[PDB]
Every structure is written in structure tokens, then in C-alpha cells.
Amino acid sequence: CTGLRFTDDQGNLYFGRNLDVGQDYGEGVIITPRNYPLPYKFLDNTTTKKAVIGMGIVVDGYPSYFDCFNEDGLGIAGLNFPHFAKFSDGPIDGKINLASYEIMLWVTQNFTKVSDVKEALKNVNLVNEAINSSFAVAPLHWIISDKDEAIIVEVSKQYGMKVFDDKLGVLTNSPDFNWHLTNLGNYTGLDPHDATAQSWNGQKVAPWGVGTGSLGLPGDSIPADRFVKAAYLNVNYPTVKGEKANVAKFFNILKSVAMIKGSVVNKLGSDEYTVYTACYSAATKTYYCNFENDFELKTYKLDDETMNADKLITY
Amino acid sequence: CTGLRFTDDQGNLYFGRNLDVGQDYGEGVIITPRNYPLPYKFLDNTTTKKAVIGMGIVVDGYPSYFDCFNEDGLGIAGLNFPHFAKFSDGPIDGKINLASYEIMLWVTQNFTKVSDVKEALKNVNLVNEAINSSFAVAPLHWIISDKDEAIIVEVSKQYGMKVFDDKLGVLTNSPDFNWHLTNLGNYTGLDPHDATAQSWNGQKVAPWGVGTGSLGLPGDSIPADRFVKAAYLNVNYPTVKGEKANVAKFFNILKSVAMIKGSVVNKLGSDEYTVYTACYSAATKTYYCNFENDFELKTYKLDDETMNADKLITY
Amino acid sequence: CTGLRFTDDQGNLYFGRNLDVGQDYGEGVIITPRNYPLPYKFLDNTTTKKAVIGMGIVVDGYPSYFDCFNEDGLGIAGLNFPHFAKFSDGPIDGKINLASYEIMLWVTQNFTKVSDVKEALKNVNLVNEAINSSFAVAPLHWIISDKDEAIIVEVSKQYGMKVFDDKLGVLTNSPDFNWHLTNLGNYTGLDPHDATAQSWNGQKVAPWGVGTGSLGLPGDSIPADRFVKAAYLNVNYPTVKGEKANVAKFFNILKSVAMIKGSVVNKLGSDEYTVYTACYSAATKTYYCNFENDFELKTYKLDDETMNADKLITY
Amino acid sequence: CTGLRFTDDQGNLYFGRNLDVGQDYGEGVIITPRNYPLPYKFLDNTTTKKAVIGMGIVVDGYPSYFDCFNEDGLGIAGLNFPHFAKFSDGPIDGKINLASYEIMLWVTQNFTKVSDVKEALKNVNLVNEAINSSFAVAPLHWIISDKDEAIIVEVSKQYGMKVFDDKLGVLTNSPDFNWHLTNLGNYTGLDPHDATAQSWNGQKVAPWGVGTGSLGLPGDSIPADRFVKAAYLNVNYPTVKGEKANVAKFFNILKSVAMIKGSVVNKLGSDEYTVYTACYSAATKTYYCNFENDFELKTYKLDDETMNADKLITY
Ligand SMILES: [K+]
Ligand SMILES: [K+]
């Protein structure tokens, strides 16, 4: 998986992710309307303060999201964090206890500003518990963003719960976020500007085509390498104007770092690849997505009809 | 640029390209109908006998194509070949003399089989002449394909005219095609299969995520590096079923190797990037494209209406 | 810098380092004999009880070592650790307080087993103080080894004091040691075994020479890349027999990852390169070294003569 | 194998090679004195015009050299050239016919200047024949050098006989020399100057140590990779003064690109590694060498005693 966010020159947010997996979970776009029932394992059951949209599966009436985005422009995406993610054996007294899967709706329902999310997380404890005993607990970490800031939430056996400011606007998978930040120092030789003709002891050595300044940029799907490349592309991609250009920019970047079918076979013999790529535009409250076997952009919207529905809207 | 071709298991051809440039040239989709006037600089003037579709620019009624594809499922794309391409100073008696830009329509009008093209190219002479003196001659090389085979045509100062069978289904830019073929032997270490946990003198060393077998796959836009990655992806991408899946597979591959805006600045200070990606489906006579600033797939079609029109159709 | 240790099949230790710097420090080989005065900044002054040998400089009669090795087969090397190394403002009551430069002789004088060192370091506090006002405090970390185990000692602002078991037998520079261990997992695609001929959709793609399994092995001098390569080389180098063969193996590995003059120019305009390579053979109590401008191996030995001298012996 | 040459600022030549093979061949230093019997397969038998020194094997009184250097400062080294090298099926009338192994003494016996060698090679034909039936023909190419110029000689099935000027002063193995020269253009991003602190959207991204400018420099033993690194190191290594410093510079470069035992296993299960490194100093007529299992520099010299001996001098 790769998560990505950026804004245009006016603070309109574009935020989304590739889902890179080796199986079909049956996911689809789900709109959760306002005042929908919202049960919690360790908190008072309530109803939704806000409408949200995202990709997920419905389980006994509960919309379980891979990523979701609220009508007020705040979103979250859960990304695989294997060999690292580790949650509580059970709830802890005096903490806001959440089964890990509950963080998706806890964040998007209760907040609009990442600043408030960060303050609240100081008292959150994530618990190693699935929605029911028929599901395993996914080892995830999360990227959360509004128009001003993205943060990373990681709860690991190694380090406990850590929350990072993510000025790069990207996230991939293991290892931990600070490891990846540190890795970027090793790629400061990367330069968008082309090299030019040189004299190697009088032998002319000159580029054959453009792109020579990014010598050493990795193109494989190892999480560390997609992090380096996603960050490099995001920070150097110009700011563009308008919905179409910003959505295209977003898909240009994530399709660049997609996991291509056939090029990755896991130890069990299964292909792993980018099954979908999705972008939420906060400005238009529109969720854009396409799929490995269907490249046409599909669009779904939080609007008057959908946000005020009486039930979950599934597509 | 990157050209790409493959088929499904029924022999349906998908064939197209990224155009990587620093500039919008004002190009667009042009359908050239049957019976359209076709002058030549050295051959007899005639008319088109086959409808073609592709991206290009109209100059004084003449459609000058970046890529184009005839109704019988054979196509050609011209890609940048700097520091190599060089054509004859003039026509040569006894040869089929073509100003280099004329190869696009000469190929698509006169052939349905690449085996016929390869035979006729033995007596072809490309000439260093533009449609008129108000235009430069572009230093190009070409990939030509039908459902059965792709060939590369290169005319260089270094080696004269060479025609290669292209079983990899790909082409990028300089240097010459045999140089790139030879380069692939240096990447035989690439493996789609993940590595697994190792013992380095008792220290556990194990992958953090999937993708570790392709260690060393380059991710920059240097032509040689895009050639290795495009070829690697194409031969390992499985055969897929149906029009939507094959079109998506095509764009999955070419967007993976696209030149991302801001990540490449040429020596004159201009961004170079993939301005469009296009795919011709022979089976549906459909030209699909999207653009750097508009990601939605657009479709243009050779059908009874467009193939028999009285004029060039421009969109 | 790169530090390196391994043994033969009989537990004879070979342990040393490259010194990669951009200034001439006038270093030379120093033997400190038994019963030599040994002042401390915070501990009671004393005398040496074990002869040591290594490279360093003499300050006011004090041998300040880059690396040193005692007659009982235990040694230590200090390597640059910039942007990480951070020692305490002053001594802490209750701790064994050492100015950081004092760890060299404190380790080699008081210990013959790394397991005792590990235990004792639990009460050590390193202090940010140089030998005198005219010297800056060097931002170092250390590798310590006997014939059975190597440990890394790092004291950082980020993490405080950490002590690691170093099964890879290597150390370079920043960042911290657990970061480097973690990085190794991204290189599990490395394989000493050559690849063999492949068919890329019927195109024969085959190695031109040996070595194709180590595709992606980095050859630059970034510390993380020298760490990967040094570790890979050390753990895959066969065990060899005898002093000559083990010393050559040692220099083969370290010269492979040396920083070559002219290939690295620091931000101040100065060449940085491997000024010397040194190997201590515990079995023969011999210090072998050569220099950037003189490749002949020079040998210096802890002798009945030298170990019982009346003064420092400086070459 | 890697061949290497350079001069100091007085035109003093230092020229040598790594031999990278799977097993020791029993080779050793051989001095061939003046007036020594010199048979030829297809030329008149004669005696040596000059004394030469190098590494090789004596076969029935004939010194068969891996590299040899004459008393007037001209030398030659034969390196592996598999999948390319192809010599003529028998001698050709009108040519100077040499069994490929005979080029070693023919060049060093008959010439002082590389300019004269280049002119003479216009009439040379290399024949596919070994010294006798007990040996196979090795697929070799050659680097030849004096104080002014180095040339590469390659005779291939693909291109016939080619002679190149080698301003880089390096040679490795396959593919052909022009392929490698062309490859260098893809490494123009290499820069000895360190990168400096950067702001990635406000995130400080800065080097952890020196060496960041050479990002992407390959460190594996694939011939194309060692060629890039050897060329890069040689042209950027400063000119140094005096015999000791120049010999050390020479071993610094070649040991940097040595093939390290255990890191390369060919497809027949054999380790491949640098068995020796050797440097001929023309100014002192001294052959220096060390071996994988003995790092001490050994020295052998052409002087009045050895150049006027009455037999081969072996060591
Ligand atoms: K509840
Ligand atoms: K003869």
C-alpha cells in the first residue's frame, strides 16, 4: 500500500491510497450517512456525527473501512504494518479504548482538525480485538490528514504508540515511520535536474536522454523503496490548479508507485499488486477510484441525498 | 517515451505509448478516413486506402502522427532517438524513398502484416527532409506491431538502417535497441518471487514487506532504466481476459514507467513528463488515451461513420 | 569508517578498521606498556595493567587511540557517529563516569571478556568532555570485540545508551545500529549465486559475466551502503586457515569497502578517504596496517620487549 | 578481471590488473630475458628482443603470460571476454597470423609505442589455436598501454576485430568495449561532491555521512558495474607523487573493485574472486603483486641480472 496527500494552492485536499494485496476481500465503496448507528466495544454506542465515504466491507451492519473520509475534509487510511503492529491484550482503565478497527470511524466521526486528533490520541489505547471472532486482527498503521497536516499513527511492540507529523504526505508499509524518514537522508544525491556532458579524462561521457539526475531512485515494490520514491515525487510535483488536474496529478503519482501484477509473488505463491487506487477530493466531497482490471475513473459523492440517507449506501 | 504492446490469448492486440516531452504541442486525436489525399515527396501521390487513428498534428491538410493505427490492426509509433537518428541527405535511385515523417502513413496504408513490412523495408531509404522547411526533422526511431510480432526500425549515423524483432514488446529512447537488449543480461538477478528469512551469521535478516526479489529494479526515467522496467513488467504481467482488463493492464504498465512531472528537469530548465498515454485496441478499433492533467480515459473509434468521412476528423 | 571482526575455525580473532577522514591527524602506531600512568578525569588515577597496541596520537603523554587492542585479545575501535552521538553535560553521582575519549583505555585495561564489558556498562556514564580545552569532543560510537562476541556501544540524544550484540561483525557510521540492522531486511534479494539464462517472452536474456546475483549491492560510500556491503561480504566470506590467509581476508574485505580518494568531497571542499586500514591478530598480538599513500603491510607486535617498556613506544 | 593504468605527472606509468577466476592456475611471476628462444605457430621462430616481466605459466619452456610488461614500458593484459571472443579458424594469407595466446609476447617483444602497435594491428589476424592439445583457447580481450595511450583489442563473433582508444584507462569483461563506454552516459548523475541538507516540504532531509553524491554507484561484480566504478574511481583519483604513493593509489583502486571470495558463486557452483592484484611500474621496472591469501606486496624487477639471464627466471 501507498498513501498520499497534498493540496492545491487554495488548500483543497487530495488524499487517498493504493491497496496492494494478493486476495479479493469483496471491498466496495460505502457511504455511511449522518445519525447512523455506531456501536463501540469499550465506549458508549452512539450515532454518526458526520457522513463518511470510503472503500470497505459491511459486517453485520458495520461499515469496516480500508480508508474513509468525512464530509468536513478529514480522512484516514489503514495500511499494512506487518512484523510491527501490536495492540493491547485488552482495554486499559482511564484510556479511550478502541479495538484497532474502530479507529477508522472514531477519527472521522469525532474530528475535523488533525490538531484535535493529535491531542485526543494521547489518551487512546488500541486493543487487539476484531469485530467478531470470525475475523483476524489486521496489523495496520494509519495516515490521517486534513488540509493542513498529515500524521502517522503507529502502535508497535518495538515502540508502543507513536504519532508523527508527516510533512512528506506519504506512507507505505514496514518498517516504522521514523526508520523511513531517516532513510531519506541516504537519497539526498537525488536531483530532478539532468546531468550534462562531462570529460572523463578527455573521454566525452554525456547523457543519452533526460532523467540522469535521479540515478539510484528505486523502482521495485519493497516498502522502503516505494516510500523514497513516493516522497520524492510528491514533494517535487508542482502545485496544479483545479479538480481535474489535481485528481490527475494524484493518480499520476500513485500509479507511478503501484505494485504491478506479475512482478511480485509472495512466499505462498500469490501475486500481490495494486488492486485499486482511490482519491478523495475534500473540495467536491468526491471519492474517485479505479481498479487493476478496469482503468476508468469511477466517482461517488457525499451530497444531500447520500449524506442524509436512512441506511448504508453501497455500490 | 515508452512504447508497449501485447495480446490477450485470442490474439487481440493492445499497442500504444507514453509521450514524454517538456511541452504541449497542441496535438490531438485524428482519424484519417479512407480515400484521403496522400501526397509523397518522392513516391507517386495517391489516396489512403485504410482508415487510421492516432495522436498527431495537422499541417496543411496532412496528418502528422506521433502514433497511428490502421483499421486492420497494424500500427506504428515514433519515439525520440536523439544522438543516434540520422537519415539520408537525399533520395537514392532504386530505393523506396521516404522523408522520415512519411513512414507513419506509408506503413499503415500499405501493410496489414509486420512480416510484409520487414520485407519491404529492405529497399526503403529514409530521407532527412521535413514536410516543409518551416519544420525541423525529428530524430526518431519506430516500433511497429501487429498481433503476431513487433519490430523496431532504427536508422542511425552509427549503424545505418537496422530492423529488430522485439519480443519484449517495448521501446524507449536512446541508445540503440541492441544496446538495450544487451543491457537486460545485467538484470538477470531480478526475480518476481519474494526473498525469505535469512541467517547472516545468526542475525535474522528477513523482508519487511513483499517485493524483495526485484532488488535493483531502477525507478528513474533514464531511457535505459525505463527499458529494463517496462520489459520486466510486460513479460511478467499475466495474460488477462477481455477488453476492459487488457486496457487496464496496458495503462497499469505504462503509468508505472511514466515520467512524473517535476521529477525530471532538462538542462534548459524545462520539466519533462508523460503528457499522454494512449492504447489502441485492434479488436474494438478503439483509441484510448488520458493526459497528465486529465486522468479520465477518453475513447475514439474507427467505425462506419468515421472510416468513411469526407474530411479528417479531429477532436 | 568501517569496523570488522571475525575468527578462524580455532577462535583466533582478527579485528580492525578503516579510518575514513578528511584531515591528517599525525596518527601513528602506539604501544602502551604495562604499568604506564593512566589518569582519569573522574575516576581515581591509576596505571595500566595490560599492554595495548593501536593507532592514535600522544597528547601530554596520554595515548589517545582511534582503535586499541590489549594483550588478552580484547579490543575497541571508535568510529564517527555524527548527528547522533551525545554525551552527558557532567558526571553523575553513583555512575562510573568517563569522558568519552577515556572509554578506549577503560575498556582495554579492565576487561578480557565482552560479557563483562556488557555488564559493567550498565553503570557507565559518558561525559561530554575532551582531554583538554584545545580539542573538540568527537561524536563517536564504538565496536568492542573479543574472540566470542562483538558489541556496539552507542550513546545518542535520540536513544540514550544502547549496547547491541553485533553478529554481523561490522560497523560503519550514522545512523544508529538498529537502523542498519533493520535496513538489511531490504537487501534479502541479494544472492551470491549467479543468475542463469532466462526467456523473456522468447527473448534470450543471459548474464554476460559472473556476479549477477548481487544486483543492487551498493558501491558508494554512504555509511548505510558500506554497512550493507561489509555485512554481506563478512558473512559470506569462507572461514580460512592460518595467520597470512586470515589477515589477507581481512584486508580483502575492508579494502573492498574503502573510501577511495577523489571519489568523495565533503561540503567544505575536502577529499574524504580511507587513510589507513589496520588489523589486530589476537593470536600473534600483531597490529598490521597500511596507508593510502603506502600499501605495504607494516607489522607491530606486543612483545616481551614492548609490553614491559619504560615509556610509550611510538612508530 | 579489471585492468587499470594511469601516470603520475612525469609520465611514469602504472599499469596492472586483477585476475578474477574460480581456482588458482599455478601461476607465478616469470621474467623472460633478452635473447630467449621465441617460437611462433605461423611466423618465423626467433629470440626475444627485450626482457619482459609478468604473471604466467611456463609450458615447455614457453612463458604464457596473463599480463606482461617489457623493459621499455609497454605492457598488455588479457582479460576474460566470454560470449564475444572469437578468433579465426586457421591462419589467413596476407596477414600476420598469431595464435591468440601469442599476442602477449608479440606486442611486448616488438614494440615500444602504442601508436606503432595500433598501426601494426591493422594487419594482424588472431587464430583459434592453443599452445598444444593439452590446453583450451581462452576467450580473451586485451588492454595494451604505454605512458601515452591505452588501447583495447577485441576480436568478436559480433563485430570482428576492433581497436579502441581507452582514455578511461580501465577494462573489465563482457560485453564489448563500446557497449561499456555507452553505458557510462547513464551514470552522469554520479558526483564526488556530497549532497547537502534539503527541505522536502519543510521536512529536513540531510546526509547522515559523507558519500551521498555517488548514489547509484554499483558495488556488485557484474562486469558492466565494475567497469563503471573502476572508470569513475580512476578519472577522479588525483595525480599523486612518487613510487610508493602511485603504487598505493593503484592498489587502492583495484582492491576497491576486487571480486571478494564467497560473494560470487558461478552456475557450476564455483566461487569466483580476485586471486591476485598486480602493478607494473615502468619507472622502476618493478612488478608488484599480492594474492587473495597473502596480502603482503611482493616485488620482482627487470634489472641487469634478470634481463640478461640465460633462462626464464621463475619465483
Ligand atoms: K458499547
Ligand atoms: K615457426
Numbering used by the authors:
A (entry chain B), B (entry chain A), C (entry chain C), D (entry chain D): 2 to 316
Task: Provide excerpts from the study.
Bile salt hydrolases (BSHs) comprise a diverse family of microbial enzymes that catalyse critical BA transformation. Primary conjugated BAs synthesized in the liver, such as the tauro- and glycoconjugates of cholic acid (TCA, GCA), are deconjugated by BSHs to generate cholic acid (CA) (BA names and abbreviations are summarized in Supplementary Fig. 1). We found that Lactobacillaceae BSHs display a clear bias for either glycine or taurine-conjugated BAs. Notably, each monomer contains a loop that swaps into the active site of a neighbouring monomer within the tetramer and places amino acids proximal to the catalytic residues.
